[PDB]
């Protein structure tokens, strides 16, 4: 299904290596030509060795082979469609009718399911089957669970967006602290849960939790080979500032938070800026405060030519 052989040849010939330089020691010149022709399957072990002989990254080879796009299988297409249905809420119905029934078919489809449920709440679309069956679904998915995979964190990240924090709380706790890295994808979803949960805590002034998520994130920087996402690290760090402000009413912290929000504008992160402004506004309100003239200036400017923004979506 993946023209891996094609890639081996391409890389081999570009690098000027001869077939002998690859199959010698590994396999027969006849069978290798069968591999490089995309007629005979290749084991990850074989590919692993060819990768070492070529001097090109294993994963890069896979990517070049066509696995560099999560559109290789069913679920892939469905996730890409979420973005589409999010800006074209008219395509919701017919599509949601097809996903809803398969929501428990695999963690993949459930993540996709929650994906639609998000679009619905956003566009104030009625999804009665949700409120009626989610607690059941979760019970079914997370009951005899001991370890969690990347999609697990993905699911909980989206869950935090369509379910009151209190219901999601108990499901999260057994998923941290994290002890190892298992890929960029895994490292990314494990940070999203933390980042969304830290946001919810702060918005609820639930500082005991916010503190917890901050420590959990901080801990991730300790783990070897874990790719800490820049943006998140910046946005989480901003939440850290507002956290210190709610704690010791320290003004420096508030300034730093505002200053961070500024940087997002300076570097071009339009949505993140819009997002954190509307956020610092609300949190300041609940605190009997009035943010600086600019922060408060952007707000009305956004909430008018925006009113109801689309949440961030990573893929």
């Amino acid at each position: 299904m993946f023209k891996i052989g094609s890639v081996l040849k391409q890389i081999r010939q570009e690098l000027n290596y001869h077939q002998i330089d690859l199959y010698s020691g590994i396999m027969s010149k006849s069978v290798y030509i069968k591999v490089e022709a995309d007629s005979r399957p290749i084991s990850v072990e074989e590919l692993s060795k060819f990768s070492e002989r070529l001097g090109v990254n294993f994963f890069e080879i896979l990517n070049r082979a066509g696995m560099n796009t999560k559109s290789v299988n069913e679920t892939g297409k469905e996730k890409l469609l979420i973005s589409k249905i999010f800006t074209n809420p008219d395509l919701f119905d017919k599509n949601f009718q097809r996903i809803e029934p398969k929501r428990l078919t695999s963690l993949q489809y459930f993540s996709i399911y929650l994906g639609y449920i998000s679009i619905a709440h956003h566009y104030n679309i009625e999804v009665p089957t949700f409120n009626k069956t989610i607690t059941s679904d979760l019970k079914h998915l997370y009951d005899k669970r001991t370890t969690f995979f990347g999609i697990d964190y993905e699911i909980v990240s989206n869950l935090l967006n369509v379910l009151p924090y209190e219901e999601v709380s108990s499901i999260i706790k057994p998923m941290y602290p994290i002890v190892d890295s298992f890929g960029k994808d895994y490292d990314l979803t494990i940070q999203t849960v933390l980042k969304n949960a830290l946001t919810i805590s702060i918005m609820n002034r639930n500082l005991k939790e916010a503190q917890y998520y901050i420590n959990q994130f901080e801990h991730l920087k300790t783990i070897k080979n874990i790719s800490i996402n820049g943006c998140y690290d910046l946005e989480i760090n901003y939440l850290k500032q507002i956290y210190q402000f709610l704690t010791d009413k320290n003004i420096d912290s508030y300034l730093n938070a505002v200053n961070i929000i500024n940087i997002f504008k300076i570097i071009g992160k339009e949505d993140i800026h819009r997002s954190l402004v509307e956020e610092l506004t609300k949190i300041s309100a609940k605190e009997k405060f009035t943010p600086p003239k600019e922060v408060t200036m952007y707000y009305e400017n956004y909430v008018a030519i925006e009113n109801n923004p689309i949440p961030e979506i990573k893929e």
Binding site: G115, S157, L188, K195, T199
Partner: peptide, 7 residues
């Protein structure tokens, strides 16, 4: 805010 992740 709440980032929707679909990797």
């Amino acid at each position: 805010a709440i980032t929707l992740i679909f990797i």
